[PDB]
Design an enzyme around this catalytic site. Structure first.
Site, PDB file in Angstrom:
ATOM      1  N   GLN A   2       0.792  -1.203   0.000  1.00 37.42           N
ATOM      2  CA  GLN A   2       0.000   0.000   0.000  1.00 37.42           C
ATOM      3  C   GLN A   2       0.835   1.268   0.000  1.00 37.42           C
ATOM      4  O   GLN A   2       0.685   2.133  -0.855  1.00 37.42           O
ATOM      5  CB  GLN A   2      -0.901  -0.023   1.208  1.00 37.42           C
ATOM      6  CG  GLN A   2      -1.790   1.150   1.300  1.00 37.42           C
ATOM      7  CD  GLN A   2      -3.044   0.841   2.045  1.00 37.42           C
ATOM      8  OE1 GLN A   2      -4.122   1.287   1.652  1.00 37.42           O
ATOM      9  NE2 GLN A   2      -2.931   0.035   3.101  1.00 37.42           N
ATOM     10  N   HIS A  45       1.042   4.101  -3.056  1.00 35.37           N
ATOM     11  CA  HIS A  45       0.376   5.383  -2.932  1.00 35.37           C
ATOM     12  C   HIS A  45       1.289   6.572  -3.083  1.00 35.37           C
ATOM     13  O   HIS A  45       0.904   7.675  -2.713  1.00 35.37           O
ATOM     14  CB  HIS A  45      -0.450   5.469  -1.662  1.00 35.37           C
ATOM     15  CG  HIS A  45      -1.688   4.634  -1.725  1.00 35.37           C
ATOM     16  ND1 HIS A  45      -1.730   3.418  -2.372  1.00 35.37           N
ATOM     17  CD2 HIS A  45      -2.936   4.832  -1.226  1.00 35.37           C
ATOM     18  CE1 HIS A  45      -2.943   2.904  -2.271  1.00 35.37           C
ATOM     19  NE2 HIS A  45      -3.696   3.740  -1.578  1.00 35.37           N
ATOM     20  N   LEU A  65      -4.933  -2.616 -12.145  1.00 34.39           N
ATOM     21  CA  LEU A  65      -4.237  -3.868 -11.961  1.00 34.39           C
ATOM     22  C   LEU A  65      -3.710  -3.979 -10.541  1.00 34.39           C
ATOM     23  O   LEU A  65      -3.950  -4.952  -9.859  1.00 34.39           O
ATOM     24  CB  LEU A  65      -3.082  -3.871 -12.931  1.00 34.39           C
ATOM     25  CG  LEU A  65      -2.221  -5.108 -13.050  1.00 34.39           C
ATOM     26  CD1 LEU A  65      -2.934  -6.127 -13.912  1.00 34.39           C
ATOM     27  CD2 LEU A  65      -0.917  -4.717 -13.697  1.00 34.39           C
ATOM     28  N   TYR A  66      -3.059  -2.934 -10.073  1.00 32.81           N
ATOM     29  CA  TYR A  66      -2.497  -2.962  -8.737  1.00 32.81           C
ATOM     30  C   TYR A  66      -3.440  -3.006  -7.542  1.00 32.81           C
ATOM     31  O   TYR A  66      -2.996  -3.401  -6.471  1.00 32.81           O
ATOM     32  CB  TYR A  66      -1.514  -1.816  -8.536  1.00 32.81           C
ATOM     33  CG  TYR A  66      -0.176  -2.272  -8.034  1.00 32.81           C
ATOM     34  CD1 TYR A  66      -0.069  -3.216  -7.027  1.00 32.81           C
ATOM     35  CD2 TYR A  66       0.984  -1.829  -8.631  1.00 32.81           C
ATOM     36  CE1 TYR A  66       1.164  -3.709  -6.647  1.00 32.81           C
ATOM     37  CE2 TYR A  66       2.223  -2.319  -8.260  1.00 32.81           C
ATOM     38  CZ  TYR A  66       2.311  -3.260  -7.272  1.00 32.81           C
ATOM     39  OH  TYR A  66       3.543  -3.771  -6.940  1.00 32.81           O
ATOM     40  N   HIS A 116      -7.043  -5.152  -3.040  1.00 33.41           N
ATOM     41  CA  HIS A 116      -7.741  -5.074  -1.783  1.00 33.41           C
ATOM     42  C   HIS A 116      -8.036  -6.405  -1.037  1.00 33.41           C
ATOM     43  O   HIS A 116      -8.210  -6.408   0.194  1.00 33.41           O
ATOM     44  CB  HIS A 116      -8.940  -4.136  -1.959  1.00 33.41           C
ATOM     45  CG  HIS A 116      -8.536  -2.707  -2.159  1.00 33.41           C
ATOM     46  ND1 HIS A 116      -8.356  -2.119  -3.387  1.00 33.41           N
ATOM     47  CD2 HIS A 116      -8.168  -1.765  -1.252  1.00 33.41           C
ATOM     48  CE1 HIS A 116      -7.885  -0.870  -3.172  1.00 33.41           C
ATOM     49  NE2 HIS A 116      -7.749  -0.597  -1.884  1.00 33.41           N
ATOM     50  N   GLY A 167       1.054  -7.212 -15.008  1.00 28.09           N
ATOM     51  CA  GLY A 167       1.502  -6.616 -13.764  1.00 28.09           C
ATOM     52  C   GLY A 167       2.982  -6.442 -13.505  1.00 28.09           C
ATOM     53  O   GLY A 167       3.338  -5.640 -12.652  1.00 28.09           O
ATOM     54  N   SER A 221       5.323  -2.845 -13.678  1.00 30.91           N
ATOM     55  CA  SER A 221       6.075  -2.796 -12.402  1.00 30.91           C
ATOM     56  C   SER A 221       7.606  -2.915 -12.403  1.00 30.91           C
ATOM     57  O   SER A 221       8.244  -2.679 -11.374  1.00 30.91           O
ATOM     58  CB  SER A 221       5.442  -3.723 -11.331  1.00 30.91           C
ATOM     59  OG  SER A 221       5.594  -3.232  -9.992  1.00 30.91           O
TER      60      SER A 221
HETATM   61  C1  HEM Z   1      -7.465  -1.239   5.432  1.00 26.27           C
HETATM   62  C2  HEM Z   1      -7.537  -1.642   4.021  1.00 26.27           C
HETATM   63  C3  HEM Z   1      -7.526  -0.833   2.879  1.00 26.27           C
HETATM   64  C4  HEM Z   1      -8.378   0.133   2.719  1.00 26.27           C
HETATM   65  C5  HEM Z   1      -9.188   0.774   3.864  1.00 26.27           C
HETATM   66  C6  HEM Z   1      -8.225   0.663   1.312  1.00 26.27           C
HETATM   67  C7  HEM Z   1      -9.060   1.598   0.691  1.00 26.27           C
HETATM   68  C8  HEM Z   1      -8.891   2.211  -0.549  1.00 26.27           C
HETATM   69  C9  HEM Z   1      -9.812   3.191  -1.146  1.00 26.27           C
HETATM   70  C10 HEM Z   1     -10.853   4.014  -0.402  1.00 26.27           C
HETATM   71  C11 HEM Z   1      -9.415   3.497  -2.401  1.00 26.27           C
HETATM   72  C12 HEM Z   1      -9.910   4.582  -3.410  1.00 26.27           C
HETATM   73  C13 HEM Z   1     -11.124   4.394  -4.324  1.00 26.27           C
HETATM   74  C14 HEM Z   1     -12.447   4.772  -3.640  1.00 26.27           C
HETATM   75  O1  HEM Z   1     -13.018   3.919  -2.922  1.00 26.27           O
HETATM   76  O2  HEM Z   1     -12.920   5.921  -3.816  1.00 26.27           O
HETATM   77  C15 HEM Z   1      -8.168   2.759  -2.464  1.00 26.27           C
HETATM   78  C16 HEM Z   1      -7.352   2.996  -3.495  1.00 26.27           C
HETATM   79  C17 HEM Z   1      -6.161   2.379  -3.596  1.00 26.27           C
HETATM   80  N1  HEM Z   1      -5.777   1.311  -2.763  1.00 26.27           N
HETATM   81 FE1  HEM Z   1      -6.437   0.761  -0.971  1.00 26.27          FE
HETATM   82  N2  HEM Z   1      -7.159   0.149   0.679  1.00 26.27           N
HETATM   83  C18 HEM Z   1      -6.712  -0.781   1.567  1.00 26.27           C
HETATM   84  C19 HEM Z   1      -5.546  -1.439   1.275  1.00 26.27           C
HETATM   85  C20 HEM Z   1      -4.748  -1.311   0.139  1.00 26.27           C
HETATM   86  C21 HEM Z   1      -3.666  -2.209  -0.159  1.00 26.27           C
HETATM   87  C22 HEM Z   1      -3.057  -3.287   0.744  1.00 26.27           C
HETATM   88  C23 HEM Z   1      -3.351  -1.917  -1.409  1.00 26.27           C
HETATM   89  C24 HEM Z   1      -2.384  -2.501  -2.118  1.00 26.27           C
HETATM   90  C25 HEM Z   1      -1.324  -1.677  -2.550  1.00 26.27           C
HETATM   91  C26 HEM Z   1      -4.184  -0.910  -1.878  1.00 26.27           C
HETATM   92  C27 HEM Z   1      -4.167  -0.447  -3.171  1.00 26.27           C
HETATM   93  C28 HEM Z   1      -4.863   0.641  -3.585  1.00 26.27           C
HETATM   94  C29 HEM Z   1      -4.655   1.345  -4.868  1.00 26.27           C
HETATM   95  C30 HEM Z   1      -3.767   0.989  -6.022  1.00 26.27           C
HETATM   96  C31 HEM Z   1      -5.434   2.417  -4.859  1.00 26.27           C
HETATM   97  C32 HEM Z   1      -5.587   3.444  -5.964  1.00 26.27           C
HETATM   98  C33 HEM Z   1      -4.941   4.751  -5.527  1.00 26.27           C
HETATM   99  C34 HEM Z   1      -5.457   5.979  -6.280  1.00 26.27           C
HETATM  100  O3  HEM Z   1      -6.482   5.829  -7.000  1.00 26.27           O
HETATM  101  O4  HEM Z   1      -4.847   7.080  -6.134  1.00 26.27           O
HETATM  102  N3  HEM Z   1      -5.036  -0.503  -0.897  1.00 26.27           N
HETATM  103  N4  HEM Z   1      -7.859   1.970  -1.351  1.00 26.27           N
HETATM  104  C1  LIG Z   2       8.395 -13.482 -13.108  1.00 28.28           C
HETATM  105  O1  LIG Z   2       7.520 -13.382 -11.981  1.00 28.28           O
HETATM  106  C2  LIG Z   2       7.186 -12.131 -11.539  1.00 28.28           C
HETATM  107  C3  LIG Z   2       6.161 -11.961 -10.584  1.00 28.28           C
HETATM  108  C4  LIG Z   2       5.868 -10.685 -10.154  1.00 28.28           C
HETATM  109  C5  LIG Z   2       6.576  -9.646 -10.659  1.00 28.28           C
HETATM  110  C6  LIG Z   2       7.572  -9.869 -11.597  1.00 28.28           C
HETATM  111  C7  LIG Z   2       7.847 -11.116 -12.008  1.00 28.28           C
HETATM  112  C8  LIG Z   2       8.132  -8.639 -11.933  1.00 28.28           C
HETATM  113  C9  LIG Z   2       9.309  -8.487 -12.808  1.00 28.28           C
HETATM  114  C10 LIG Z   2      10.236  -9.680 -12.690  1.00 28.28           C
HETATM  115  O2  LIG Z   2      11.035  -9.714 -11.710  1.00 28.28           O
HETATM  116  O3  LIG Z   2      10.001 -10.679 -13.442  1.00 28.28           O
HETATM  117  C11 LIG Z   2       7.523  -7.676 -11.266  1.00 28.28           C
HETATM  118  C12 LIG Z   2       7.655  -6.218 -11.516  1.00 28.28           C
HETATM  119  N1  LIG Z   2       6.545  -8.253 -10.440  1.00 28.28           N
HETATM  120  C13 LIG Z   2       5.747  -7.675  -9.483  1.00 28.28           C
HETATM  121  O4  LIG Z   2       6.175  -7.484  -8.373  1.00 28.28           O
HETATM  122  C14 LIG Z   2       4.368  -7.254  -9.785  1.00 28.28           C
HETATM  123  C15 LIG Z   2       4.007  -5.943  -9.623  1.00 28.28           C
HETATM  124  C16 LIG Z   2       2.709  -5.563  -9.725  1.00 28.28           C
HETATM  125  C17 LIG Z   2       1.717  -6.491 -10.001  1.00 28.28           C
HETATM  126  I1  LIG Z   2      -0.330  -5.918  -9.987  1.00 28.28           I
HETATM  127  C18 LIG Z   2       2.080  -7.813 -10.217  1.00 28.28           C
HETATM  128  C19 LIG Z   2       3.404  -8.197 -10.107  1.00 28.28           C
END
Ligand code: HEM
Ligand SMILES: COc1ccc2c(c1)c(CC(=O)O)c(C)n2C(=O)c1ccc(I)cc1
Ligand code: HEM
Ligand SMILES: *[C@@H]1O[C@H](CO)[C@@H](O[C@@H]2O[C@H](CO)[C@@H](O)[C@H](O)[C@H]2NC(C)=O)[C@H](O)[C@H]1NC(C)=O
Ligand SMILES: *[C@@H]1O[C@H](CO)[C@@H](O[C@@H]2O[C@H](CO)[C@@H](O)[C@H](O)[C@H]2NC(C)=O)[C@H](O)[C@H]1NC(C)=O
Ligand SMILES: COc1ccc2c(c1)c(CC(=O)O)c(C)n2C(=O)c1ccc(I)cc1
Ligand SMILES: *[C@@H]1O[C@H](CO)[C@@H](O)[C@H](O)[C@H]1NC(C)=O
Ligand SMILES: *[C@@H]1O[C@H](CO)[C@@H](O)[C@H](O)[C@H]1NC(C)=O
Ligand SMILES: *[C@@H]1O[C@H](CO)[C@@H](O)[C@H](O)[C@H]1NC(C)=O
Ligand SMILES: *[C@@H]1O[C@H](CO)[C@@H](O)[C@H](O)[C@H]1NC(C)=O
Lengths: 551, 551
Positions: free
Chosen positions: A171, A175, A352-353, A356, A494, A498
């Site tokens: 997370q 972010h 993709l990322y 949740h 992904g 990444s």
């Molecule tokens: C306590 C658990 C978590 C909560 C409360 C949470 C909540 C949220 C919410 C509120 C959104 C924005 C969309 C919306 O609903 O309006 C979001 C976006 C995001 N979250 Fe989480 N999340 C959690 C954990 C995580 C984790 C572990 C990841 C993994 C990296 C993650 C990845 C993302 C991503 C990629 C975005 C998009 C950011 C953006 O649009 O700027 N979140 N999350």
């Molecule tokens: C070959 O297996 C993998 C498995 C996961 C891998 C990768 C290779 C590579 C590159 C590499 O090292 O191959 C990255 C960047 N990865 C990530 O951490 C990743 C990031 C975001 C998301 I959504 C999904 C995967």
């Protein structure tokens, strides 16, 4: 009907419209010729007819520990990795191409950095159905689709051994390059930087960095609570934070990423890094008594980007993979290659990322088991327990599988609803098109995507066509690899995004990868040997179990 | 004393300070080892011991018309040029390194695009003399230095045949990537874009582009005067322009580069391009009836950047050189190379480029010979005479030599005074250091720099040391090559910056260099065959003598 709705051009050829009813595919440098970029060149033909499937490879890389151990000790470790780096990256265009506003190359797209870029242009607004030519005229209700196939019924823990320490790490780090401008709408980001600039530590703008800065020894401000170092208060560093109404400044920690105040995990990592930044400042000043604040500060930040880039790679990307092949972070493996030290966060990637499912049902801190309602805006849990306690806790509690279906806790299930909805505003192309973009064969039926018949049957009556299955759902409903956290698409779409995202930072360029960039051998090694354990432990009174793997 | 004031580290090694009195040279990838990066590697040794001087080469390239004619018709034309492109470019770092604020690599430098970058860090503010270790504690009075060695006494026309058409072309094109923020001070630019973005036509910001835009057929607004197309009035396109107080909006032409209103030459070229942009819009719409304003507009702009990049190269860079070798603009010569499609305007370059000697004593338009006081803020001369008339005029009147000394007209001699002064604020390193940076041998005496004894003798008593001779003066006082417009330094520092600057635009990348980027073969050829004559003539009732060479 817009001929381009048929997605006529294969292999990345570009569908340009002509006249009222014509179209032309630009197959420039695609490796194919013909009206639809479908006739390969002898080499292209070989290159592909000999490409062992993703599945076969992910088999090998997760097998033969013994054989790998040897390889890992030979030069072949670099040799491979390099290949990974190059190959993996080609999939991602640079300079960037389209954006929410332009499904064509354009100076504005290339220069207006407020936009997230995208790999495939949108589904033309004049197509028969939302996904182009196939599927129904109406798409499955996001809400329903979410409760039917993503709602966690029974917690499925991630088979690989991933814990909350990794979850929260995921997370935090994300972010810093995912930061959608709610004021501008989807497609717009506040994270100009589009990458690992560590702006979630220093701020996404000068004004805010200056607020967070001590302006002494290159140090970042902070406060002592219980004899421990923690981010300063909004009172000391009058910076904008998102805390619920009713919470006083003196109870809010100012940190850089306004959102980080709503989750101990987030504020846990913000504390470790703040600590780390000030620690490095000392190492530097000692070495360079002559330096000032700025230089200590600037050089400190470059060392942390380096640290971050390394761990993110050798410990973070290692866990996900599941691989036996020791992923090496070495910017030099790319010095001979043709690579563009530049990056731009794609919308296809922000989605993709969105992992949740990883969040558990409750958060266990020792004998204590806290609920979401007790975790979520808990301004006191971190100072109460302190870094070590939480680090041990999250390192021990497993996180849930990411792929597979029905594993997102109800508390945050709304987020998935929003994702699917945004996807549609963004007019993302169908999942199957994405498969092809990233070099995979498109699914022929729902039963092939999901590894079964029940969900497949219903997804079918909802979508109508597999060729109408949306991106996000297709990413979280597809079948997981053997004992994996997720599967194929996630891993084949992904990774590129990444990897190119990391190795493309300016510090990885030959121009910057010099010991002098980091203040000498000391900063340089800090980078060269960064490690999760060192990161936590060199900044804590005691050193807890600290890992991305559950014990 | 700051050890780095001695410029200890050779061959681009980096002088890092340590302790209170130590220093270390980072010779990473410099081709040399040792405490000062002075001991070469066997290859480096050969590579340099076999490099024929600049002088010898500029001899060959300006000689043997017959031999060249053949080469020019073989593949060797590409072969060479490519080499030019690669080799020439290595001299310039990317990603960029230092800025007015940081004499070290830093995230802020790399990301804050308001700064001009610089190739050599500044002269540490704690050095004995202004230039480091040598010369006097006080530098020659800018004003005096300017009247003694730069003041035009007798007009020396440029031997190569350069005319005002080229002169004005030089100004126009340069003021699109040279645009110092007077509000921020030296070191800061308003031209974020740092290159050929054609922002001097469309504006340096969205708001302004939207003001200048017709929002119809991709067309740029405009007005008809005498049955001819001219930039719109500030009344129609309420955009900020710099016109002297007392001039009404209805008499000011809005154009994109606020400054362009103070010189018919400038407003002449602004008119040719506006005309050209609208002309291409038509070619496009015809081809793509389905397109909208934006796409016609965006694609039009990419075609013009391409046009510009070509002419700037095959006609503009050809004139300067003096060369017989047909300079080819082909982005593909670089597809095999390791090149970074990225650029950043260096301060060292804003200076180098400041070719004010080019302006003549008076401006002759037929039997009419206008004075500076009649040319300078002449809101009527262009509409009065019309494009053709002026184009013929400037194409026929020679411009003055740029190198050599005493050739800058008194009317603008103040500008040179300011340049020298800014140089000092910027704390630029000495000319001789620049020589070395760009691979040249530093001058041993003033009499070697200037090709004589008189000026040399006085420059000597003014500067004290040749090793204290400043950048700008050293650039304009050094001896010209045979029958050249200027010499060595200008051409060996002035090209890199000026080539990497072009071939590094995103449109030259394999990603963008596709017929589809330009709306198909038509836009693509427009780019591929752009030409000064076509540019003027396809946009004028009659076609005058039009060239960068005087008849
Ligand atoms: C306590 C658990 C978590 C909560 C409360 C949470 C909540 C949220 C919410 C509120 C959104 C924005 C969309 C919306 O609903 O309006 C979001 C976006 C995001 N979250 Fe989480 N999340 C959690 C954990 C995580 C984790 C572990 C990841 C993994 C990296 C993650 C990845 C993302 C991503 C990629 C975005 C998009 C950011 C953006 O649009 O700027 N979140 N999350
Ligand atoms: C070959 O297996 C993998 C498995 C996961 C891998 C990768 C290779 C590579 C590159 C590499 O090292 O191959 C990255 C960047 N990865 C990530 O951490 C990743 C990031 C975001 C998301 I959504 C999904 C995967
Ligand atoms: C009628 C003759 C010309 C006049 C009136 C003129 C005047 C000026 C002035 C006023 C400055 C700014 C510094 C200052 O004095 O405060 C300047 C900057 C500039 N001029 Fe000219 N100039 C002329 C022709 C040209 C030409 C032919 C070139 C060649 C390209 C040129 C190149 C430059 C450059 C590089 C700058 C720096 C731009 C910047 O700092 O943003 N000028 N000129
Ligand atoms: C980047 O692009 C966005 C979208 O075009 C620009 O934002 C819009 O700009 C126009 C003109 O200023 C306004 O009418 C809109 O209200 C703006 N906001 C949004 C959310 O559309 C933005 O100005 C561009 N930024 C730069 C630096 O060019
Ligand atoms: C780019 O750098 C310049 C210089 O640091 C920044 O401008 C200064 O920023 C600080 C804080 O906002 C102010 O106190 C100064 O008055 C600003 N102006 C000048 C001329 O120094 C500028 O804000 C930076 N821009 C970005 C986008 O980061
Ligand atoms: C080999 O002779 C020359 C002579 C001039 C050349 C070049 C080569 C090159 C590159 C190349 O074609 O070699 C460029 C970019 N030049 C310029 O137009 C230039 C630009 C700004 C300044 I101030 C001085 C010169
Ligand atoms: C090109 O694709 C279109 C749309 O799928 C199809 O109708 C046409 O037959 C194709 N042409 C060829 C030669 O494949
Ligand atoms: C915050 O966490 C602490 C544990 O450190 C707990 O005692 C407290 O009740 C929590 N606050 C809320 C509102 O749940
Ligand atoms: C390195 O450069 C310094 C400063 O010019 C000089 O005093 C010293 O002798 C040099 N050392 C060597 C080995 O050249
Ligand atoms: C402007 O130029 C015209 C020639 O077209 C000339 O007659 C007029 O006097 C000039 N204006 C000034 C103020 O010199």
């Amino acid at each position: 009907v817009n001929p381009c709705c048929y997605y006529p051009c294969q292999h990345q050829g570009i569908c340009v419209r002509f006249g009222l009813d014509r179209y032309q595919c630009d197959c420039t440098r695609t490796g194919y010729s013909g009206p639809n970029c479908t006739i390969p060149e002898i080499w292209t033909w070989l290159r592909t007819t000999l490409r062992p499937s993703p599945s076969f490879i992910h088999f090998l890389l997760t097998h033969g520990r013994w054989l790998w151990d040897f390889v890992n000790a030979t030069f072949i470790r670099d040799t491979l990795m390099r290949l990974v780096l190059t190959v993996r990256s080609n999939l991602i265009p640079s300079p960037p191409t389209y954006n929410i506003a332009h499904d064509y190359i354009s100076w504005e797209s290339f220069s207006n950095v407020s936009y997230y870029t995208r790999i495939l242009p949108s589904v033309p607004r004049d197509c028969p159905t939302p996904m182009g030519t196939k599927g129904k005229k109406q798409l499955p209700d996001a809400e329903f689709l979410s409760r039917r196939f993503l709602l966690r019924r029974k917690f499925i823990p991630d088979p690989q051994g991933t814990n909350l320490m990794f979850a929260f790490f995921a997370q935090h780090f994300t972010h810093q390059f995912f930061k959608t401008s709610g004021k501008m709408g989807p497609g717009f980001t506040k994270a100009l930087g589009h990458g690992v600039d560590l702006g979630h530590i220093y701020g996404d703008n000068l004004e805010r960095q200056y607020q967070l800065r001590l302006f002494k020894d290159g140090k970042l401000k902070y406060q002592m609570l219980n004899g421990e170092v923690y981010p300063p208060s909004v009172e000391e560093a009058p910076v904008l934070m998102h805390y619920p109404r009713g919470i006083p400044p003196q109870s809010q920690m100012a940190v850089g990423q306004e959102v980080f105040g709503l989750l101990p995990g987030l504020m846990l990592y913000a504390t470790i890094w703040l600590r780390e930044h000030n620690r490095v400042c000392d190492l530097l000043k000692a070495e360079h008594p002559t330096w000032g604040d700025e230089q200590l500060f600037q050089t400190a930040r470059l060392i942390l980007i380096g640290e971050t880039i390394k761990i993110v790679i050798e410990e973070y990307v290692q866990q996900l993979s599941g691989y036996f092949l020791q992923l090496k972070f070495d910017p030099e493996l790319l010095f001979g290659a043709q690579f563009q030290y530049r990056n731009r966060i794609a919308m296809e990637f922000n989605q993709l990322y969105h992992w949740h499912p990883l969040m558990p049902d409750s958060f266990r801190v020792g004998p204590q088991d806290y609920s979401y309602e007790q975790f979520l805006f808990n301004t006191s849990m971190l100072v109460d327990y302190g870094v070590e306690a939480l680090v041990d806790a999250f390192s021990r509690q497993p996180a849930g599988r990411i792929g597979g279906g029905r594993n997102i806790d109800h508390h945050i299930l709304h987020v998935a609803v929003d994702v699917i909805k945004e996807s549609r505003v963004l007019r993302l192309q169908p999942f199957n098109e994405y498969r092809k973009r990233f070099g995979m064969k498109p699914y022929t039926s729902f039963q092939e995507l999901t590894g079964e018949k029940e969900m497949a049957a219903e997804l079918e009556e909802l979508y109508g066509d597999i060729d109408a299955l949306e991106f996000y759902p297709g990413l979280l409903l597809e079948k997981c690899h053997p004992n994996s956290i997720f599967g194929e698409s996630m891993i084949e779409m992904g990774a590129p995004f990444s990897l190119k995202g990391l190795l493309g930072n300016p510090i990885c360029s030959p121009e910057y990868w010099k010991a002098s960039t980091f203040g000498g051998e000391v900063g340089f090694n800090l980078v060269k040997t960064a490690t999760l354990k060192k990161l936590v432990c060199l900044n804590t009174k005691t050193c807890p179990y600290v890992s991305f793997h559950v014990p």
